Write a protein that binds this DNA or RNA. Structure first.
Length: 74
RNA sequence: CAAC
């Protein structure tokens, strides 16, 4: 729950709706961050598309950094 | 729920 960064922009590398997670590449550091489906703000009410630009917070999850509050840019 |  510890917030590391906010209003980070990134590109969805892939998001798998069967597994319910994917990875976003941060535009500011070029590092991949894990994104779980429950972290996406609202058929797939919580999903993002491969190649999409998204805005998110980076928080400290159980297994390291992860995306939170994932939305479109702006 | 950590490389599909």
């Amino acid at each position: 729950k510890k917030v590391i960064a906010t209003k980070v922009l990134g590109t969805v590398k892939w998001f798998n709706v069967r597994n319910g997670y994917g990875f976003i590449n941060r535009n500011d550091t070029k590092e991949d961050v894990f994104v779980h489906q429950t972290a996406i703000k609202k058929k797939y009410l919580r999903s993002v598309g491969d190649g999409e630009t998204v805005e998110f917070d980076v928080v400290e999850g159980e297994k390291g950094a992860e995306a939170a509050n994932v939305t479109g840019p702006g």
